[PDB]
UniProtKB/Swiss-Prot annotation, chains A, H:
GO terms for biological process: protein import into mitochondrial matrix; protein insertion into mitochondrial outer membrane. The keyword NADP does not apply. Belongs to the Tom7 family. Its main location: mitochondrion. Forms part of the preprotein translocase complex of the outer mitochondrial membrane (TOM complex) which consists of at least 7 different proteins (TOM5, TOM6, TOM7, TOM20, TOM22, TOM40 and TOM70). This is Mitochondrial import receptor subunit TOM7. The chain crosses the membrane at residues 1-17. The chain holds residues 25 to 60 of 60 of the full protein. It is a single-pass membrane protein. It is found in: Mitochondrion outer membrane. It comes from Saccharomyces cerevisiae (strain ATCC 204508 / S288c) (Baker's yeast). Keywords: Membrane, Mitochondrion, Mitochondrion outer membrane, Protein transport, Transmembrane, Transmembrane helix, Transport. Residues 18-36 are mitochondrial intermembrane.
UniProtKB/Swiss-Prot annotation, chains C, K:
It is found in: Mitochondrion outer membrane. This is Mitochondrial import receptor subunit TOM5. It is a single-pass membrane protein. GO terms for cellular component: mitochondrial outer membrane; mitochondrial outer membrane translocase complex; mitochondrion. GO terms for biological process: mitochondrial outer membrane translocase complex assembly; protein insertion into mitochondrial outer membrane; protein targeting to mitochondrion; protein transmembrane transport. Its main location: mitochondrion. The gene is TOM5. Forms part of the TOM (translocase of outer membrane) complex that consists of at least 7 different proteins (TOM5, TOM6, TOM7, TOM20, TOM22, TOM40 and TOM70). Keywords: Membrane, Mitochondrion, Mitochondrion outer membrane, Protein transport, Signal-anchor, Transmembrane, Transmembrane helix, Transport. It comes from Saccharomyces cerevisiae (strain ATCC 204508 / S288c) (Baker's yeast). Belongs to the Tom5 family. The chain crosses the membrane at residues 15-33. Component of the TOM (translocase of outer membrane) receptor complex responsible for the recognition and translocation of cytosolically synthesized mitochondrial preproteins. TOM5 is involved in insertion of preproteins into the TOM40 translocation pore.
Swiss-Prot record, chain E:
Belongs to the Tom40 family. Keywords: Ion transport, Membrane, Mitochondrion, Mitochondrion outer membrane, Porin, Protein transport, Transmembrane, Transmembrane beta strand, Transport. It is a multi-pass membrane protein. It holds the Pfam family Porin_3. GO terms for molecular function: porin activity; protein transmembrane transporter activity. This is Mitochondrial import receptor subunit TOM40. The gene is TOM40. It comes from Saccharomyces cerevisiae (strain ATCC 204508 / S288c) (Baker's yeast).
Curated annotation (Swiss-Prot), chains F, J:
The keyword Mitochondrion applies. It is found in: Mitochondrion outer membrane. This is Mitochondrial import receptor subunit TOM6. It comes from Saccharomyces cerevisiae (strain ATCC 204508 / S288c). GO terms for biological process: mitochondrial outer membrane translocase complex assembly; protein import into mitochondrial matrix; protein insertion into mitochondrial outer membrane. The chain crosses the membrane at residues 6-26. The gene is TOM6. Its main location: mitochondrion. Belongs to the Tom6 family.
Length: 36, 223, 37, 50, 329, 35, 326, 36, 50, 35, 37
């Protein structure tokens, strides 16, 4: 679990990315401003 | 808080400690004054012979009596936590010998001051400097350095002392003191200041057993 | 003294399993209560 | 005397009940008057519709 | 074998959700903070929750300084990953084999402390719910498993009242045999669904009894007790003596469409309040305050819960509008 | 005057019984507003 | 004396009100607390102006636990009593012999503390303002007196600019000679009265320099600096002047008043008073100190009510007949 | 000033009570609830 | 390495500016939204007039 | 990089002149909302 | 020793009164400046 200090968050981010019809980039995915 | 206790308060001290399997217990009855920053302390040993000398016992054996002027009353901590209780833990590192690790709580039990001191001295050599009894009956004025740490909102003291050896040398030892108040009332965080203290050591000729008489004058400057 | 405490907790687990089976058949006991009176 | 100490504990209990009712009631009154403002805004919207 | 299905019994709730109407819906135990607590959240999708969550906090020992939580739900798998400041990652994966059967594994690395894991399998039926969890599981060199294992079973013995039990086994040091404790749970649900009662005689004697009452459509109110029992020595001490610490809390909750109120009175003189006013459909300000009358102290924390989207139609759906711009029914 | 563990569980039981009578009454329905 | 009336000089403000535009209208020195602050004030009359106030507070070392207050002002005599918790009584009393001359007294009796007194003669003229006050006066046994006595002269050199000095004489114990310090005050006011400047070279070298700017009809903003010149020893002494720069902005609206300050020490603060009712206003103040990474947040309410019927209608914005006012 | 530890507040209370048209009682004067 | 510590101090400065802008802005945004609500109330009153 | 009390008064003076330029600018007027 | 400090504070008060008298006549001095140039 040496990956797991940085690893579970991009896995659930990829799981959110795979089930979104907008399909945004990581700059839109991390930053808390609303953007379409 | 302790502004009504500016006069003479009777001071009872309870010192229990062990140094390489040697049991000693020094107790004493004395008084301290705040309006004039002085202390009249007469300490009488009950066990008898002292394994540790009296310069290594004085800093452990009541800094709430400092003569304070009107310009530094805001930067005083020791009249805010003393009724609630004032627990201090010290790390005194002697050069080329062991270390003093003591637990002392300065709180008002009943009406008199009761100082429950629990000391532990580890890694000491008997043929060194402290335990060979080469310390004379004298003390040097020491400027206690006080800085405030906001992680546990307390008082940390980092200062050094000068102990006079009989053969013509000096002892360099540094204090690492951590002070923890008990109550959660009005706490005051001061700036960096120092206590300009001086001490006089004399002996009472009208006493039979091993006794220690200390005279202490505490003054403050810096802010 | 450890083995007596271990078999004490084993009897506690056995009493927990017996009272779990008792709470499983209890609906039928309350149906038998509703059959009477 | 005892009347002064009874006044002391009555004043502390009156302060305790007053700031307890104030802390427990002022955001409750904020929520209640926000509901009254929203209900009267919906009433004026219904009067615009009717 | 015959009349167990003939009663058509109601499935009770989970043992973790036994006091959910009292402790979570009404009370202020899970909802209190100190200092500013900004909680910026943005949901990318509606069917998949995909709720990104930034948290900024100061002045609270429990709350992290920065907390980034990504939550994905596809209606059969639930995943939450929260990276706290100091690189502490806490991820929970709840997978459902059925709607009845849900298995949840929670991991937390703390980056300088031992990793804390919880493995749970939860089963529901027509009449009974069995939850088996282990907190910090490990396997020893021997057959015994070091860790805490809690298995709890609750069955509706009547339609109104459900009775149940909870077994805790603790194997912390490994060399000693573990301690086992049985708790008894009781949930009386009214036939009008007005007031429920949740009693719980715990393993350590903590008699937690709670009542929840829904007086109207917008206000509920509850009252719990704690009654934790334990032998405390008096002033080496001479001996020990049982001194049960008891505390009774009574709270109310006002659920309006623009604001949420939660207000508790305590046995210790701990008066607490919590208002979440949704001053925008997106941004909702919250204030929580606590006056501890026993120590004459207070703790007041304000903050906001920002809520936005990452697509156009959920951005309009948060504002009550369609993607064409028409307001919804 | 008695200060007991029985006093603490009697005080908690009295607070629970008085809260149940406070919370099942129509005085609590008077405490709940209609608008 | 011929061209002095011919210049038609504007009377400047008082020396206490030299930084009123900056340090009281905009900044957060005297608009801040911690913990809950309930301020239950009811008026009784507006032209006799009789207000009775209550103050419930916790979590602040500056605010008392409960403070009852009574304020009476008939636009020639001002009076204010303020009994705190444990019977600490404060009394302010102004009297106006003219509208320019005002004699103020202030008493502080705290039941165990020594009594603090302040006496103040204030005079305004067409071109200058003289304010002489004494903090804690005491009649010494000799031909002198012990306490603090400041005097302050401010004369408008131009219509735009006013210059003054404040002299502080301090006699703490009487036997020592009193310290005397001269502070030079400067106030440049614009001809459109939009931005003002207030510089103040103090007795201890504390160069308090402030600038106030009213950008619109609802928002002001002001920035001040303080350079306290002091000697701190490190055997030897060393002059170490501590500098602090504050910059804030006040947004004044009909519903809400907001004040936001940035500091040079990172001590970011904010104060919002939102009037949910015309009677009742909820105030919140927060402060993040980034230098020590610690925060202080205090909420509260200011409730305003009346003791008569027409003031009860007048505080709600209505008439006594039930109609709203214009 | 032995009376002044309890007496400055009733002096300004009498000064305010003399100059009000309603002229209320002391229960209405001390309590912060609105009452004409 | 040094890039990680530069990322850490940039993250600290970004958090500092974010919570400073949040604490300053959100009561100011609440006041601005209340002013927009009162302006919309006055504008709906003027639309009732016309 | 040497730190002095002259550095502190230079930092306070630079902050004051920078604040004066920040506060007399039309960017400060843009920071004021019109409604 | 204290008398020199006391007469220094007295001379500070005297020069403060002299510069206060200067600040009283300063608007008239500005008028003489504005009459020139």
């Amino acid at each position: 679990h040496n990956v797991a200090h940085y690893g579970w968050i991009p896995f659930v981010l990829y799981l959110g990315w795979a089930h979104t019809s907008n399909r945004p980039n990581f700059l839109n995915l991390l930053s808390p401003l609303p953007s379409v | 808080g302790e502004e009504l206790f500016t006069g003479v308060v009777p001071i009872l001290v309870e010192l229990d400690g062990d140094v390489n399997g040697h049991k000693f217990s020094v107790r004493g009855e004395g008084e301290g004054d705040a309006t004039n920053g002085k202390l009249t302390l007469k300490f009488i040993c009950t066990t008898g012979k002292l394994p540790v000398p009296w310069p290594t016992l004085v800093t452990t054996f009541v800094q709430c009596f400092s003569r304070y002027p009107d310009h530094m009353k805001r930067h005083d901590f020791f009249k805010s936590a003393m009724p609630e209780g004032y627990v201090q833990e010290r790390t005194i590192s002697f050069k080329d010998d062991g270390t003093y690790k003591t637990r002392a709580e300065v709180k008002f039990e009943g009406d008199t001051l009761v100082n429950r001191i629990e000391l532990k001295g580890i890694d000491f050599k008997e043929d060194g400097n402290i335990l060979g009894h080469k310390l004379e009956y004298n003390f040097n004025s020491h400027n206690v350095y006080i800085t405030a740490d906001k992680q546990k909102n307390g008082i940390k003291a980092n200062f050094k002392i000068r102990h006079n050896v009989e053969d013509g040398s000096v002892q360099l030892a540094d204090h690492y003191q951590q002070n923890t108040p008990i109550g959660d009332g009005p706490v005051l965080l001061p700036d960096n200041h120092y206590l300009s203290t001086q001490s006089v050591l004399s002996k009472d000729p009208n006493e039979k057993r091993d006794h220690m008489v200390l005279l202490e004058f505490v003054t403050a400057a810096g802010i | 003294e450890k083995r007596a405490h271990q078999e004490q907790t084993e009897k506690t687990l056995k009493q927990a399993a017996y009272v779990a089976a008792f709470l499983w058949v209890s609906p039928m006991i309350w149906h038998l209560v509703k059959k009477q009176w | 005397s005892f009347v002064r100490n009874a006044f002391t504990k009555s004043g502390n209990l009156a302060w305790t009940l007053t700031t307890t009712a104030l802390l427990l009631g002022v955001p409750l009154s904020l929520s209640i008057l926000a509901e009254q403002q929203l209900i009267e805004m919906e009433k004026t919207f219904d009067l615009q519709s009717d | 074998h015959s009349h167990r299905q003939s009663l058509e019994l109601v499935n009770p709730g989970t043992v973790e959700n036994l006091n959910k109407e009292v402790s979570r819906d009404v009370f202020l135990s899970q909802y209190f903070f100190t200092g500013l607590r900004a909680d910026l959240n943005k949901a990318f999708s509606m069917n998949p929750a995909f709720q990104t969550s930034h948290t900024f906090s100061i002045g609270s020992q429990a709350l992290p300084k920065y907390a980034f939580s990504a939550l994905f739900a596809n209606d059969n798998l639930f995943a939450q990953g929260n990276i706290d400041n100091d690189l502490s990652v806490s991820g929970r994966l709840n997978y459902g084999w059925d709607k009845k059967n849900i298995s949840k594994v929670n991991l937390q690395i703390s980056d300088g402390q031992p990793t804390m894991c919880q493995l749970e399998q939860d089963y529901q039926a027509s009449d009974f719910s069995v939850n088996v969890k282990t907190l910090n599981p490990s396997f020893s060199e021997k057959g015994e498993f070091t860790g805490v294992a809690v298995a709890s079973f609750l069955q509706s013995v009547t339609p109104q009242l459900a009775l149940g039990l909870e077994t805790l086994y603790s194997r912390t040091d490994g060399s000693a045999p573990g301690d086992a404790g049985v708790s008894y749970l009781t949930r009386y649900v009214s036939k009008k669904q007005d007031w429920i009662f949740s009693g719980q005689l715990q393993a350590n004697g903590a008699l937690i009894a709670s009542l929840w009452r829904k007086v109207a459509q917008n206000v509920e109110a509850g009252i719990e007790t704690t009654l934790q029992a334990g032998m405390v020595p008096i002033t080496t001490p001479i001996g020990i003596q049982p001194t049960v610490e008891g505390s009774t809390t009574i709270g109310a909750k006002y659920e309006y469409r623009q604001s949420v109120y939660r207000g508790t009175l305590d046995s210790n003189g701990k008066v607490a309040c919590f208002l979440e006013r949704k001053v925008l459909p997106t941004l909702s300000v919250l204030f929580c305050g606590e006056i501890d009358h026993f120590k004459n102290d207070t703790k007041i924390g304000c903050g906001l819960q920002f809520e936005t989207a990452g697509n156009q139609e959920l951005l309009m759906l948060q504002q009550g509008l369609d993607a064409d711009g028409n307001p919804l029914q | 005057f008695k200060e007991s563990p029985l006093y603490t569980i009697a005080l908690n039981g009295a607070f629970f019984v008085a809260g149940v009578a406070f919370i099942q009454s129509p005085l609590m329905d008077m405490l709940a507003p209609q608008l």
